[PDB]
Subunit: 161 residues, 8 copies
């Protein structure tokens, strides 16, 4: 019942992307919370959120943001938990600013970064699931079934119009 | 004593970078194995490595390569374990090729990607440690010490 | 009758692009097969496909994929045949990730890479045809006619609205 | 005597770049402090620095960092003071990561961004001076001299 | 009543972007002027505008332009005032040419550069306000209220469709 | 004895890169010719080279150049033979210009493009060999040996 | 009456861009020809076109192409005349491939390169006019009038919606 | 004897690049002047230079600069003469900033742009020569010789 993953994002505009992480965690029956935390507009909210995450029982944080994306990195600055970062696609630079802002963390403070956009959001949830699966055999079985099914569902030839 | 993290790299020329992940795991006393596995030159070696990793008791795989860096993604394709990707700085394109080749995985098969180069190698080991810390209280305490020491050690002013 | 080129692609979404390779091979009367093989979702299918390609009588593989595109490279890892890679245009990064993921193969395992998108797909078929033409005089004549006609069909001035 | 500009930088390795901002402020006789504050390694040090800057009588903050450079943006998040950002040239991506990480702030929290590297460090100090000059006539005159000397000193032909 | 900020832009096409700077200065009750000055088409107009800005009572210049954007840099060449530059998004290169053309000023002639597009325009006004706030306590209070309200208005969770 | 692969390059400064294609063809005992042909400085030399290549009994052309690299594309324009393109690493843009100039051929005139630099030169020769192997069983066996040795030689762990 | 500028382009698809060069030359009363010449599909047509340009009385060549754009460079390889290159915007890479393919000519064979797209086409005509103006006083007066008018037609403030 | 080409550059640090344009003009016996004019540090020097260029009998201006390279565009803004732009290779971004800052001129004010670095400097001088050749038959013949010698001198095979 209690959340074991936190999904955080910098704004409502990030939800179109971050919803894919939420949906996948629900699919895999992983209890989680989904919040807006702005690194730029609510820095003390972020400090408190990240500092207290482990004691609140969270095991993984998925953080999504675009542009000069500081949310995942600053979350990782304050938590000892693994933080996974989703680069949200930006208007002009198509998430290249998002990506570099997230992935290029200095040695000492990791962010596990996924692909730009919805694929990255979905993969952040799957990566979070694979982490939790290491010490939750029920989840590990559900993940195995999920991966096996993905493999089995790939067609052999295209629908050629 | 038995490895719980596998560090794999596409070639000897990646060692200068991946040694930083090795050093960090050793500092934190995390049993690990350190291997050369090339997605493109040794594809069956990779298939067997990745397929058997969980049975062997590995919990996290750290995979580094440069150029068109297929090693992390293909590893993730064959294992259910978390795979962390280190883009090795390439000669021409300075790891931008490595970075895009690794991070841009389609939905369904994740690679947790870290920075280009030595920083990313170190951070992949730290990220692996933070994952292992979730169910190893002694290591969690050692990782807390490591992070606390990092923070406390930053000078207040430049020399 | 038996296929001498294999066209493979990572997903149905690649078909809009890869159809151009299929169409050109048909135009030149080159027997071929057209399949979906996912490097990420069906890695053992790919290993078996690429490992057995030469013994099944294939001479050239055209492989198309986008994003972090591993399909052409991993195909080449397992076959001694020439593998030609088509970078499928991606949403955010416009096929730049596709291109670099395909073309930047390490020394030892080649992928002959074509342009991003439909042009690359068509050129992969033409390149495949030029390879087969070296030891198939009927095809060589058809290719010569095809190239000659392309040259002859270029107008001398634009239709100026 | 009390500092009116704070120069902060993510680490010692930024000093080679940020020293140019320090030198310029000193040349123009602008009292300033020069500190290492890491957004990612010392986040609470940064929070306290940025939150208290105005109370302490700082007017402008110059912040430099490389890579995923969060220092200027996070500083701006906690202060009402103008924050100027210097992208430090990174090893792999030559400060393109630093530049995008700094300049691409969403509406609401500004960072005035300067060029990558030493040029940008110098220009952040000059920009801070032009801001201070608005309400300090003696400094305004010294800045006018500095700019006049820069212009007058350019040779007419190459050696 | 007399303007203390000048907003200048290279063309009418820049207004869609630069209007956001105008609107914010008005919101904060900062008297300003809003003009078209073309570095390429009206270089002597620019020289005169920038040279006389301080004596006309301006304290900050916000300059917006796209493509090979010379307006902010050339403005700074002629004024001792702080000049803030807004990179206007360009058609092909999405404001990357704008950004590099503005931000990469040589040591000696600063331009304080903001984000590509509308966000940068709004931030240029906010940065200008923060500068003026240093010696205008009424404005400083309005800015504090403005920032505080932005912080307070961030929701705690997304509207999940 | 008569060449079946032509290696052409835009200038002497490409040799440091293109020599790797030469070495590989020689290792595999593939008769070849190695020439300097500049699309831009010797356009008629190129026209004649490319137009006559098939008559002369060439089967594959490997063409390398840097910068705005027109050599492979223009070669392909005049021959029906497969043309493989090697982007030579340029000074400023590190072969990104070379790469785009070569790979981005419009539909109708193909260039099979390989990686930037020495890797790409080696791979163009390997790709040419894999093409020739389709109708030369002795060479096919030698290429199989080469690939087998590459795979088998990869160490299991770094030094 | 006889053309003094040649405008050449690789295909009909380039005309949407290259029409702007044609229109400007007509505006300035510069006699010119406008043709399709494909470097990739009609290389011998290009060789003959470029080799004979000076003897046919042409003074400047404007060449437009996109993607891996070889037309301007190969034109310059064969003519001693000044060749100006227009990078036509490409689909995926937005004319970055066009630009680098044109501008990055090796020392020894120049192409004077203009901006990506319609602006570059118009500027190539203006650059061509400025070249011809050096030895044609009537044209020089028309160009002076044209530049003066451009300067005079810039508004002083935006139409603020 | 009176200059018909002006070479201008943003600073002394551009000379290493712009000297190649100077050498070429001298080789072809084209009278020219070679000056430092900074758009940003000496804007009025530039205004006067560019405004008076035609009166002084200049026919072509070659302008080189690096970084946010405003010199060619602003020169073109004040003169009716053809302006050719040389992007000088910058430290961080390797002249990509220089290139975009120069080539991306909006319709109405052209800059004929050449390659980044020494190549571009040489080519700007060659382009200026090809322009002057249109109405100077002696120079046209010398340029024909230069181009003929370039073509004829390319070796047939690498050393
Ligand atoms: N992508 C790839 C596949 N197999 C090896 N590599 C990469 O090739 C680069 C150069 O390796 P080498 O020196 O062996 O050619 C290294 O970064 C290595 O990961
Ligand atoms: N982004 C960031 C956060 N904390 C430090 N950095 C940057 O990390 C780079 C390398 O620092 P170091 O040598 O300490 O690892 C410097 O540019 C420094 O600003
Ligand atoms: N693009 C091109 C056309 N002709 C030569 N080049 C390239 O120019 C580069 C530099 O050559 P050089 O030293 O002769 O100027 C080389 O990569 C060569 O292929
Ligand atoms: N963009 C610009 C304006 N004024 C000078 N520059 C450029 O600044 C670079 C570095 O010059 P310096 O060493 O004087 O700082 C040179 O490429 C010079 O053209």
């Amino acid at each position: 019942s209690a959340p074991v993953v936190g999904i955080i994002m910098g704004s409502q505009s990030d939800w179109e992307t971050m919803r894919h992480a939420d949906a996948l965690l629900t699919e895999l029956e992983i209890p989680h919370e989904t919040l807006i935390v702005s690194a730029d507009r609510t820095p003390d909210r972020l400090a408190d959120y990240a500092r207290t995450a482990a004691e609140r029982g969270l095991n993984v944080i998925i953080a999504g943001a675009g542009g000069a994306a500081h949310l995942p990195g600053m979350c990782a600055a304050w938590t000892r938990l693994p933080v996974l970062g989703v680069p949200v696609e930006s208007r002009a630079l198509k998430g290249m600013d998002s990506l570099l802002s997230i992935v290029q963390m200095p040695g000492g403070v990791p962010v596990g970064t996924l692909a730009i956009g919805a694929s990255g959001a979905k993969n952040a949830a799957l990566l979070a699931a694979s982490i939790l699966a290491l010490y939750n055999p029920a989840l590990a079985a559900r993940l195995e079934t999920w991966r096996a099914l993905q493999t089995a569902s790939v067609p052999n030839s295209p629908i050629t119009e």
